[PDB]
Write a protein that binds this ligand. Sequence first.
Ligand SMILES: c1csc(CNCc2ccncc2)c1
Length: 460
Amino acid sequence: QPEPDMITIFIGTWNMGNAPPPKKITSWFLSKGQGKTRDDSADYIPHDIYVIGTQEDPLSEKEWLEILKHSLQEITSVTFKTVAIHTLWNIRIVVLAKPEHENRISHICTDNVKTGIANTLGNKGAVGVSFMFNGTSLGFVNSHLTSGSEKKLRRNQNYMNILRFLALGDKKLSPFNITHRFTHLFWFGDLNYRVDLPTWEAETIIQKIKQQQYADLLSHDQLLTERREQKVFLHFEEEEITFAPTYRFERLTRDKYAYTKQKATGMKYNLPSWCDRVLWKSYPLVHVVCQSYGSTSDIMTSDHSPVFATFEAGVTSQFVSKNGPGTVDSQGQIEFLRCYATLKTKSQTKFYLEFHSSCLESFVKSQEGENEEGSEGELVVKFGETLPKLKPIISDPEYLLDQHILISIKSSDSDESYGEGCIALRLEATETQLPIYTPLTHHGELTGHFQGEIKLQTSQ
Ligand SMILES: c1csc(CNCc2ccncc2)c1
């Protein structure tokens, strides 16, 4: 039975509005409703992995698991296995997988982050799950960020606290946050970003939604504008939105947006908004294709509609050779030549690199680089041809060309990372000097760049 080189992943996010679900929620898992929807001819084909994020979830874990499993069994006639379930207050993530994948899934991690301080601590935050699927690491984050149209900056802060403090994936990747620990990272939830138009325009916005004319609304969506200004979700992708705003509906219909201020809303307006989102970040040159992104039309117990997204995702097998794992394969080598880091720091410490990869027995520390001043005010750290030759555990090009090298640039004085990035080994050529590049981030914000040349030797 051959190992897969692709899987499909379902991501759902639903803010349930503290109400039990209706008796049938199959449309959610079938990617049916509005937006980029799934073809009817696929309805019986199970996804490999289903990841369900809820917010304002009133059910116990047991009650929700029974509903989810019975929903999937009705659609697919497959009894899914529970990989993980994790709940923080009323924020929950469930991961289900086809039974044939049970032996392929390992290193299962869960965590949560509580956002805010005092007043703002007690209901918002994130849950996450990570695991290995054969040779591929997968991470999933369900966040419920701060509400309210005038709190985009707090949402951005919530995002940075979650990616800093959520402890998922390989704890040996110590300089790296969740935005670098996984082959594929999916981040979804009630992100709570709003359409930033005047209150007086509410009925105009409703009109536009009835005409399915979303362009002048999306141009005011805070998540798209904050992303375009590099204030949040740097280096994440989102499929184009082609479904109506998913919030705020009158319950038991989808015919009415309930936007006006009420005591129950703290006297806040809730103009129709795309609160409910799915974003992703995959390592460079790994296959990831969004095959659906939309909202259901027929699940009306909440003031939000459920959102679905589905993906093709490249995966790799758990490779064994006669040499690695448990030794190096002397027929393989990675050389980083004429590399330099450009840093936005005003610090004048010396810097060294760490190279981390599951193709190495352990991470590799470089010598210190040579600091120079850049012409427009920056620090350039030059490494020359000084960098240690990396010795991969396996030299087979079928394995090595699918790997990635994480790079951290650390201060000699403090050992703290000033920037993290990732280089694909999916090169155009072996035994050939080729340009490489990654942006460097720290706490998910841009701190610099790393560029130079690579020369990869495989067994072929
Ligand atoms: C439910 C869905 S995944 C899972 C974990 N499976 C661990 C494993 C067991 C044997 N061999 C390889 C991996 C439980």
